[PDB]
Amino acid sequence: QVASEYLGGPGGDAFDDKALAQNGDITRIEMQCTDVATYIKLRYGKVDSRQWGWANENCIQWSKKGVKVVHELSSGEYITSAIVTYGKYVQSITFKTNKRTLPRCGTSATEKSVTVLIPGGLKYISGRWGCRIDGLRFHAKC
């Protein structure tokens, strides 16, 4: 399926929810948010991905941790927009659905911004992760 460009840096390890996304539509957005977004974990059908970020509790040496944010999506709700501020890492993530405008994960939004529109709805994410979110890519449904 069509995918955005990769937004972020070379750090961390690669992840790709392509296979996980066979479990279903995105039904839930889980992130950890402070001045930056430190992990993301989407639910496909009833199955969470692994926690893409905040690799271990000693990561607190290099950024704050943040609070766990959960946005449950209703059936027929899908993500149609992502605003990402990024540089070497993802800084902040603001999702919108076809029903809702979700709050930004990451209070700082000073890094360069990109708005990615996903008509028909996001299918899954890939990117790179470690103590935080090194980068994100958005994959459409076709």
Ligand X SMILES: OC[C@H]1O[C@H](O[C@H]2O[C@H](CO)[C@@H](O)[C@H](O)[C@H]2O)[C@H](O)[C@@H](O)[C@@H]1O
Nearer to ligand X, 58 or 74 (CB): 58
Count residues contacting ligand X (CB under 6 A)? 11
From the CB of residue 34, how many other CB atoms can be counted at a distance below 10 Å? 16
Q: Which stretch binds ligand X (CB under 6 A): 28-36, 55-63, 64-72, 96-104?
A: 55-63
Report phi then psi at 47, rounded to 5.
Answer: -115, 115
Which residues fall within 8 angstroms of residue 134, CB to CB, at 6 or more apart?
8, 9, 10, 11, 12, 88, 89, 90, 127, 128
Q: Quick check: 2 binds its own copies (CB under 8 A)?
A: yes
| Interacting partner of 43 out of its own copies, ligand X, none (Cβ under 5 to 8 A depending on kind) | none
Applying CB under 6 A, the residues found at the interface with ligand X are: 11-12, 58-59, 61-62, 129-132, 134
